[PDB]
């Protein structure tokens, strides 16, 4: 049940929306991006709420802005 998006911000957003549409079971997100030559990794829980979906979308957009596309989004249905 793994999902990996690398680079495409719009498809990363399309996935995060579908994940949080109807999913009483939360999901664990792995968000990595390169900035200033260093790779940095976050682990963020995604709630099924539409609010936390909006927040996660913004975090993707902000990461895509800093890294200039060099980002990795991995989704763990855990």
């Amino acid at each position: 049940g793994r999902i990996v998006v690398r680079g495409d911000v719009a498809i990363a957003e399309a996935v995060v929306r579908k994940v949080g549409e109807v999913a009483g079971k939360e999901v664990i997100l792995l968000i990595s991006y390169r900035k200033n030559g260093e790779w940095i990794t976050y682990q963020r829980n995604l709630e099924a709420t539409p609010e936390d979906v909006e927040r996660t979308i913004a975090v993707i957009r902000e990461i895509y802005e800093e890294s200039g596309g060099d980002f990795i989004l991995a989704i763990f249905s855990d």
Binding site: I28, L29, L30, I31, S32, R34, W39, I40, T41, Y42, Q43, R44, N45, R55, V59, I63, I72, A74, F76, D78
Partner: protein, 68 residues
């Protein structure tokens, strides 16, 4: 030691390593982006710090990506 590795969540080898580690901590974006994560291998289990949660294990690929 065969260990999972950030940022690609893939696996490695580390012939000099003896233990896989898992380091989690907070930066300025902990309530926004989540907790920071660092997975890897090392010759010895890294030293504990006051604000970092570290997990060590001595088998092949014993540090999966869903930390806790």
């Amino acid at each position: 030691i065969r260990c999972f590795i950030t940022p690609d969540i893939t696996s490695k080898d580390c012939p000099n390593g003896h233990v896989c580690y898992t380091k989690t901590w907070c930066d300025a974006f902990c309530s926004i982006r989540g907790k920071r994560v660092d997975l890897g291998c090392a010759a010895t289990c890294p030293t504990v710090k006051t604000g970092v949660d570290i997990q060590c294990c001595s088998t092949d690929n014993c540090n999966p990506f869903p930390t806790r």
